[PDB]
C-alpha cells in the first residue's frame, strides 16, 4: 500500500524517493532515467519503485 | 515397523527410502572424475562422519591421493567416508553403456572404498539390487544402512551449496 522504506534484498532506504518521481515524471524523463538521477544502481530499488502501486492516494480518496 | 518397514517392502521388493533429488546430483558431482578437492575440504566431510549425534568417532583421513607438485583429494573417497565400525561392500551396473567408456557404470565398490564409477538413481537411490541398502542391509545387517544414508544426507547436499 505504501512504499517499502528498504529494498527487501538490498538495504537501501527508499520511502524518501516517491515524492521526487512524481516531480521527476513531469520533468518527463523516461522512468528508467528518473531512477538514475536518484541513486538506484541495482535491481532492487528499481523493483521497489517501478513495481509499486500507491494505493495510498486512491484508498484515502474515501477514507472516512 | 520402525527399522524394517522403511527400507524393505514386500509389495515390490524395492527400497522406498532413497536420495529423493539433489542428494543424487550432489553425490554424483562428488563422484565425477573431474572434482579434485583440498585437505582444506575436510570441511564438508565433517557434517557426515565428524558430525551430529551418534557419529563422532574420528575419521581415518583417506590418504593424500596425489603427491604431485599439487597434492589433491579425488572426489570419490570423499564420498566413501566413515571411520567407525568398518565394513565391506560391492556394486556394479550403473546407468551408462559398456566397452572403459568414460565410465559411468559398473561402479565396482569394494570394501567401503569407491574403485570406479559415478552414482545414479540406480546406484544411490530406489533401485533394485545395487544400492546403499542391498549391499548395506544384507551384509552388513541393519543399523548400518540407516546410518550411511544420514552421512549422505549431510555430506552431499551441503556440497552443492559450495558449487551451485
Amino acid at each position: 500500500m505504501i512504499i517499502p522504506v528498504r529494498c527487501f534484498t538490498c538495504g537501501k532506504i527508499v520511502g524518501n524517493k516517491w515524492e521526487a518521481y512524481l516531480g521527476l515524471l513531469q520533468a518527463e524523463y523516461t522512468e528508467g532515467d528518473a531512477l538514475d538521477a536518484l541513486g538506484l544502481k541495482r535491481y532492487c530499488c528499481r523493483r521497489m519503485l517501478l513495481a509499486h502501486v500507491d494505493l495510498i492516494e486512491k484508498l484515502l480518496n474515501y477514507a472516512p | 515397523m520402525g527399522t524394517k518397514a522403511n527400507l524393505v517392502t514386500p509389495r515390490n521388493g524395492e527400497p522406498l527410502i532413497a536420495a529423493i533429488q539433489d542428494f543424487l546430483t550432489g553425490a554424483y558431482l562428488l563422484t565425477l572424475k573431474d572434482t579434485f578437492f583440498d585437505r582444506a575440504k575436510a570441511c564438508q566431510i565433517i557434517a557426515s562422519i565428524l558430525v551430529g549425534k551418534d557419529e563422532k568417532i574420528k575419521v581415518r583421513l583417506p590418504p593424500p591421493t596425489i603427491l604431485k607438485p599439487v597434492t589433491l583429494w579425488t572426489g570419490k573417497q570423499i564420498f566413501s567416508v566413515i571411520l567407525r565400525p568398518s565394513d565391506d561392500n560391492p556394486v556394479r551396473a550403473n546407468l551408462r553403456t559398456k566397452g572403459l567408456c568414460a565410465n559411468d557404470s559398473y561402479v565396482t565398490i569394494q570394501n567401503s572404498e569407491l574403485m570406479s564409477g559415478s552414482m545414479d538413481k540406480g546406484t544411490l537411490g530406489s533401485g533394485s539390487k545395487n544400492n546403499i541398502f542391498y549391499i548395506l542391509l544384507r551384509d552388513w545387517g541393519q543399523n548400518e544402512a540407516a546410518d550411511a544414508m544420514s552421512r549422505l544426507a549431510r555430506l552431499a547436499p551441503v556440497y552443492l551449496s559450495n558449487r551451485g
Partner: protein, 329 residues
Amino acid sequence: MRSRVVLGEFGVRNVHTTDFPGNYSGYDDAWDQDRFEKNFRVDVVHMDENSLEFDMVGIDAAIANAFRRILLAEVPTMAVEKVLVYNNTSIVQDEILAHRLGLIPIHADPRLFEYRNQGDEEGTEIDTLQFRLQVRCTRNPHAAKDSSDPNELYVNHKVYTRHMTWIPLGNQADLFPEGTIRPVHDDILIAQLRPGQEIDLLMHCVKGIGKDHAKFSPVATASYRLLPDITLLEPVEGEAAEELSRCFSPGVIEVQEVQGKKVARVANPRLDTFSREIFRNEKLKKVVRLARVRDHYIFSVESTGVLPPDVLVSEAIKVLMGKCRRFLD
C-alpha cells in the same frame, strides 16, 4: 595457479583458497604477521558521505567474508524495537507503521549505550532514546482555489520523518541532544493523512544486533568483488580494438592507435561488472583470459546514515577482535 581465479565460459575454476601448509608442494606460509603484515595494505577509494570503498591486499577469503558478515548483521546500531500507541487514528496501522518506524534509521552513536535487560518499561534508564511523533492533518483553511492538489488543500498531508520530535529522559538531555539525535532522513513517507486524522506515538529505541531483526543493519553494500585482472595473449592489434572495447565494460580497455595497430591493452581492469560477452565472439575468446585475482578483495561499504562508513568498518573489525579473544582464556 595459487590465487589466480579463472572464468571459463561454463564455470569458475580455482576457487577454494587452496594454500594451507600441507596442501601444496610449493611452500605454504605457516601464516602470520611477518609475511602477512608486509604484504598487507589498505588502499582507499572515494571515502565519501555514506559510501566508502577500499582495496585490502593480502587477506584470504575467510577473514574478508568475516568482515562482510559482521558489517551486515553482527554489528549493533540504534534503531527502534518498540512503539507505544496513543490515538492512532490513521489509516493502515499498528504493524506496518510500527514496522515502518522500526525501519527508520535514528542517528545516535551505538557506542554510548548498552543492551536492555528486563526493566521498568522493559527498561527506561540508559537505552531508551524516546521519540515523540505528533502529526495532525487538517484542511488548509485558505484555499479559494478550490479543488486543487492535496499539497494545497491539506496541512502536513503526509508524515515525514521530520515530525519525529525527541523526548528527553533526564539521562541524555545534556550530552547528545544538541541536534545530533534526529533521524538521518527528514523525508520518509511514513503514512499519508487526510483531514480529521492524527497520530501520536512513543518510540522505544533499544539497542540490538543485526541477527535479531535486520532493521539493525547500518550497512547496505556489504557484498563485493575480488578484482579482475583480464589478460591478453599476442593481441588482436588493429580494428579488433572496437570489439575488445565494446565486449568489456566501457572504460576497461583503451583503443589507442591504428598505424601502431595496438588494441590498447588494459586501461582500468576494475570497472567491469563482468557482462562477459567475450566468449560469444567465438574468434576472440581464445585470446583474452579472464582472471579475478585472490589478493585484492576490493570492498565498498555504504551506511544508512547511522554512522560514517569508517566508523562501521572499524566497529566490525573490532567486534571480530572481541569475538576472537572472548574464547581465548
